[PDB]
């Protein structure tokens, strides 16, 4: 691997469902690359009969200097209209990945708990979901990292 992930911090946690995800990412690039790096955030929800996946946001970073790199990725929140009501207040996953020329080489997975912010709503969840009352809590200190060997240049 030409790129090593050195640190990753969620800056705003817990947060509203509709708040952007702020990831402070520290990495090192060990030699010059021809292309930019593409950071992506993916939502994965699990309902009874299928998963729902959403590409939440992506950003191209480059040209990448050799050595240490650090930035905050502020990723757009999910499109709630694409998520079943029951899944909006469930445990879900987000996957933060980096790719090179379209090839994913690192993936950082997080558990996320979503619940209503009022006792009455938690115990009597309404038929018509009230997204402004949903709070997310990312399990930010226990990242689930996967690395993949890729072709670089």
């Amino acid at each position, epitope marked *: 691997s030409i790129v090593s992930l050195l640190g990753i911090k969620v800056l705003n946690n817990p947060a509203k469902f509709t708040d952007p995800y702020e990831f402070e990412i520290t990495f090192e690039c060990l030699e010059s690359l021809k292309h930019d790096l593409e950071w992506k955030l993916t939502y994965v929800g699990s309902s009874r009969s299928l998963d729902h996946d959403q590409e939440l946001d992506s950003i191209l970073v480059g040209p990448v200097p050799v050595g240490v790199n650090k930035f905050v990725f502020s990723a757009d929140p999910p499109s709630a209209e694409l998520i079943p009501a029951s899944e909006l207040v469930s445990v879900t*996953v987000i996957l933060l990945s980096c790719s090179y020329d379209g090839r994913e080489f690192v993936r950082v997975g997080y558990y996320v708990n979503n619940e209503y912010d009022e006792e009455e709503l938690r115990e009597n969840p309404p038929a018509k979901v009230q997204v402004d009352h949903i709070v997310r809590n990312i399990l930010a200190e226990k*990242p689930r990292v996967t690395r993949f060997n890729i072709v670089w240049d």
Partner: antibody
Amino acid sequence: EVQLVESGGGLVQPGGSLRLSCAASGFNVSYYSIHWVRQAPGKGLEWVASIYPYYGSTSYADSVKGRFTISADTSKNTAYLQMNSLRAEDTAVYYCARGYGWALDYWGQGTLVTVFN
Amino acid sequence: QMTQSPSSLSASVGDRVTITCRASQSVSSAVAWYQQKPGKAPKLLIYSASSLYSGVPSRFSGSRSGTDYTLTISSLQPEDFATYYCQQDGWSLITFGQGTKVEIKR
């Protein structure tokens, strides 16, 4: 050439302690989660403890919480399991394994811990 | 948090075999399947419910329905008689199923 090599297993009496080590080869422990999973003869796999990268945060099985501590020394590229207050029921082969997302990809060959009166 | 059955089954080479585990949650990322043979460490087959691990034969597959997770071997080969374990990597705890030993008929 990824390898995890456990050591430190041996005979110990109840109430005693042991420190297991897991020496990583072919990879840097700072980039991965590391896990201990044990198995008694003829029995199933039982997860013991996990440590996560970047934070060094930890998780423990209820059966070992308060007695065992998992840690890592990234400069030595080694993970550890400090086992205090050992009980007869802790006898098992102890595997160290590397995290692969939510799964475990490379497992060591195991070190035997034998608690005896 | 994770229950596996049965503890054993008997089958023949060429048979389609399925093993199911019931998890406490439906999160697909959390479940993996392992193979273990006597005297050896476990080997990863499937991760995140349905992803085939590098180098594992295509006859192994994983699926999910609700909180039920299934390992399928499309056609047992002679080297597939072994014990199979599911794993749930949960919010707080990792739980392994009790294991299913696949034995050979005669």
